[PDB]
Amino acid sequence: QPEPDMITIFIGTWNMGNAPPPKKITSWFLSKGQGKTRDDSADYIPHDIYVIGTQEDPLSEKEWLEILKHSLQEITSVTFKTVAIHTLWNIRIVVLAKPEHENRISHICTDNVKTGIANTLGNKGAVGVSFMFNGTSLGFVNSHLTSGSEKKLRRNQNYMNILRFLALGDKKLSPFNITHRFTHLFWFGDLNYRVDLPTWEAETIIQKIKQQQYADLLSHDQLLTERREQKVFLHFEEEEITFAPTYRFERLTRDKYAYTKQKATGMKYNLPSWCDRVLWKSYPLVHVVCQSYGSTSDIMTSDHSPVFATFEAGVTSQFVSKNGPGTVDSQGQIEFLRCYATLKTKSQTKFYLEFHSSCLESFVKSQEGENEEGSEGELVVKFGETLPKLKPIISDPEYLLDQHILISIKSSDSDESYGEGCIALRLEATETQLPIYTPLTHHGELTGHFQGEIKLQTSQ
Ligand SMILES: CN1CCC[C@@H](OC(=O)c2ccco2)C1
């Protein structure tokens, strides 16, 4: 029974519009309909993991699990195992996996974040699941963000609150939020970003959709434009959108968008929009390939159409040698040369680095760097040659070149992280000085950069 080095992951997001689903939802899990769809020749091939995010979900967990399991069994003839299910209000995440993966999956976490204060705390937020799959950490977030075309800033704030406060993954990675804790992080949901065009243009927009001419609509998609201006989802990826806007439809057909202001909308227009989205962020130089991203055409109980995305995702095996785990492999070492952190902070305080990685017995604290001034006023923390030599638990290059080092730059005075980043050890060469780089973020906001050289020694 060989351990996989690749799995496929299905991500689904559906705002169910508080209505039970139709009797057949198989098209969703088959990635059929509009956009980048899955080849018919793959229909009987199960994905390894199915992650289902719903919003405005009127079903009990039991009712929805029974529908999902019966759907996958009908498609695949496989009885999928429940990894995790978590519900906040009407926001739900279900993770199903093939039974052969039961003993590959461990460290299952669930959490939720409620967004907003008083007025705004009551129905929006996120649920999430993480686990290990052999040597690979996987995180999944289903968020239902603030509605309304005029509230893109609120959505960006909701995103900020969710990535700060969602407690998934390894709690020993204390300086790191969910945007750094996982080999692969998938964030999906009713993100509620809208096509930001004048109200009077609604019929023009509908025309554009009927012509499958999305270019002029996507150029006004608030998620794409906010991402381009680095207001949200910094360092996340999204597949190109080639399907019609998934909101807001008249129920029981897909032929009609319902966009006009009504008492029930709070006298707001709902111009056709790509509310329903899947984004991801993987550690550098890990295999992740989007193999589908689209919407179904035949599921019409909601004012949203379901969205699907599928991924190839690189995974690693749970490595055991004669040495690690439980002792350093003295054959291996990670060295750092000419290392500098450039920070955006206006503060003048001493900094040190922490190195965190599952290839180390425990995190490593550096000595303090020496602060200098960049040309354009900036704080530059010099580490030069002073960073420690890291001693990985296993020196085998088949393990070590697949690993990553998380870096936090911490204030000596407060121990608060000013910036988090990640370095891949998937180098072009070993025993060779090679450039390294990571941006540094805090609360998912760009706070600086870390650059230098690495020199990696493996058993080879
Ligand atoms: C929501 N945003 C997105 C950009 C980064 C961060 O921006 C601010 O906090 C801010 C204050 C004044 C102007 O920007 C949070």
Q: Could you write out the DSSP letters of every residue in 13-82? A: EEE-TTSPPPS--HHHHTT-SEEE---GGGTTSPPSEEEEEEES--S-HHHHHHHHHHHHHHHHS--PEE
Q: Give CA–CA dist 77/325, Å, rounded.
A: 38
3-class SS of residue 155: helix
Measured in Å, residue 160 CA sits from the centre of ligand 1 at 10
Which residues on adjacent β-strands are paired with residue 128?
111, 141
What letter would DSSP give residue 247? B
Residue where the block lists tokens 């739900």: 92
Which residues on adjacent β-strands are paired with residue 423?
405
Cα first-last separation, the chain: 27
Nearest Cα neighbor of 67 from 335, 54, 111 is 54
Nearest Cα neighbor of 279 from 11, 80, 6 is 11
Nearest Cα neighbor of 306 from 5, 7, 16, 105 is 16
Measured in Å, residue 135 CA sits from the centre of ligand 1 at 35
Measured in Å, residue 286 CA sits from the centre of ligand 1 at 30
Buried-state track 48-58, b at ≥16 Cβ within 10 A, e below 16: bbbbbbbbbbe
Ligand 1 site, CB within 6 A: 156-157, 160, 231, 445
Measured in Å, residue 231 CA sits from the centre of ligand 1 at 7
**Side-chain half-sphere CA neighbours of 314 within 13 A:** 14
Q: Give CA–CA dist 393/182, Å, rounded.
A: 20
137: Cβ contacts below 8 Å, ≥ 6 apart? 130, 131, 169, 170, 181, 182, 183, 184
Nearest-atom index, ligand 1, CA of 445: 5
Measured in Å, residue 156 CA sits from the centre of ligand 1 at 9
3-class SS of residue 62: helix
Residue where the block lists tokens 């941006």: 439
Q: Give CA–CA dist 170/443, Å, rounded.
A: 17
Measured in Å, residue 89 CA sits from the centre of ligand 1 at 28
Resolution of the entry in angstroms: 1.5
Residue identifier of the C-alpha nearest atom 13 of ligand 1:
231
Residue 423 in contact with residue 405, Cβ under 8 Å? yes
Residue where the block lists tokens 């496929």: 8
Nearest Cα neighbor of 212 from 37, 36, 35, 32 is 35
Q: Is 204 left (phi over 0), alpha (psi -120 to 50) or beta?
A: alpha
Residue type, 119: N
Measured in Å, residue 151 CA sits from the centre of ligand 1 at 14
Q: Give CA–CA dist 214/196, Å, rounded.
A: 13
Residue 79, Cβ neighbours under 10 Å: how many?
11
Nearest-atom index, ligand 1, CA of 230: 4
Residue 308 in contact with residue 31, Cβ under 8 Å? yes
Residue identifier of the C-alpha nearest atom 14 of ligand 1:
231
**Long-range contacts, 99-103 (Cβ 8 Å, 24+):** 100/1, 101/48, 101/49, 101/133
Which residues on adjacent β-strands are paired with residue 113?
126
Residue identifier of the C-alpha nearest atom 7 of ligand 1:
231
Buried-state track 402-427, b at ≥16 Cβ within 10 A, e below 16: bbbbbbbbbeeeeeebbbbbbbbbeb
Q: Give CA–CA dist 65/291, Å, rounded.
A: 25
Q: Which of 156, 230, 441 to mutate to test the pocket of ligand 1 (most atoms within 8 A of CB)?
A: 156
Q: Give CA–CA dist 159/185, Å, rounded.
A: 14
Residue 351 in contact with residue 415, Cβ under 8 Å? no
Q: Is 152 left (phi over 0), alpha (psi -120 to 50) or beta?
A: alpha
Residue 351 in contact with residue 409, Cβ under 8 Å? yes
Q: Give CA–CA dist 56/248, Å, rounded.
A: 14
Residue identifier of the C-alpha nearest atom 4 of ligand 1:
231
Nearest-atom index, ligand 1, CA of 156: 1
159: Cβ contacts below 8 Å, ≥ 6 apart? 143, 145, 232, 233, 444
Residue 209, Cβ neighbours under 10 Å: how many?
15
Strand 370-373 to 307-314 pairing: unpaired
Residue type, 332: G
Residue 4 in contact with residue 273, Cβ under 8 Å? no
Residue 67 in contact with residue 87, Cβ under 8 Å? no
Measured in Å, residue 451 CA sits from the centre of ligand 1 at 25
Residue identifier of the C-alpha nearest atom 10 of ligand 1:
231
Nearest-atom index, ligand 1, CA of 159: 1
Q: Give CA–CA dist 267/261, Å, rounded.
A: 5
3-class SS of residue 284: coil
283: Cβ contacts below 8 Å, ≥ 6 apart? 182, 183, 184, 404, 422, 424
Method of elucidation: X-ray
Residue identifier of the C-alpha nearest atom 3 of ligand 1:
231
Query: In the chain, which residues are followed by a C-to-N distance beyond 2.5 Å, i.e. a gap?
Result: none
Length of the chain: 460
Measured in Å, residue 72 CA sits from the centre of ligand 1 at 42
What's the count of helices (H) and strands (E) in the chain, helices before strands? 8, 21
How many whole angstroms from its chain centre is CA 422?
15
- Specify burial of residue 218 (Cβ count, 10 A radius: 0-12, 13-18, 19+): middle
